[PDB]
């Protein structure tokens, strides 16, 4: 029911209202936006949200 775009490219999706972004690199900024799927009818992409992975010790 949803398509998850990390930095403009799709990385997966879900039936649920949550998704786990994996294989990211430490201390880097990212942007994520989600769209809704309804049988080959895709909504416009959502407003982007920005986050940054933590740095390891």
């Amino acid at each position: 029911k949803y398509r998850v775009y990390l930095d403009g490219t799709p990385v997966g999706g879900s039936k649920l209202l949550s998704f786990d972004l994996e294989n990211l690199k430490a201390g880097t900024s990212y942007n994520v936006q989600v769209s809704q799927i309804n049988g080959n009818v895709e909504s416009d992409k959502s407003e982007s949200v920005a986050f940054k992975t933590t740095l390891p010790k």
Binding site: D20, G27, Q36, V41, S43, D44, S46, V49, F51, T53
Partner: protein, 129 residues
């Protein structure tokens, strides 16, 4: 949600302006056939206040939720018409040609929250439009 949204797809690589009007019983929408209405040609024309936002080739015309209506969509290229019986909501584009137009049914997700963020991962959660 935010309102009633009408999507206008066009051929410009830019941000065309849209002007919204509303009117009842214009020619061809009268219930009992041509010229059976109370004011031949159409009753009071109201200018509808819209909030416009743009992506490449797609204008999103956000109107107050109170104007929300069903109806047939007619694309005349220069203008789009949302015809519901006797009622018409007219959208006039400037500087482009209307390719396709429709009431936004599949709406974009909303409250994007990044949680459980580590060096290698994060969890993205949202709410349906």
């Amino acid at each position: 949600p935010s309102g009633f949204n009408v999507v206008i797809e066009h051929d410009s690589e830019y941000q065309p302006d849209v002007k919204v009007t509303y009117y009842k019983n214009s020619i061809g929408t009268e219930a009992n056939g041509f010229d059976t209405g109370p004011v031949f040609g159409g009753e009071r024309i109201y200018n509808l206040a819209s909030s416009l936002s743009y992506i490449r080739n797609k204008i999103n015309v956000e109107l107050p939720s109170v104007y929300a209506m069903a109806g047939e969509v007619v694309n005349n290229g220069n203008e789009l018409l949302l015809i519901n019986g006797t009622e018409i909501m007219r959208f006039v584009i400037e500087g482009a040609t209307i390719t396709k137009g429709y009431v936004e049914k599949v709406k974009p997700p909303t409250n994007l929250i990044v949680s459980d963020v580590t060096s290698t991962s994060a969890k993205i959660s949202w709410e349906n439009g």
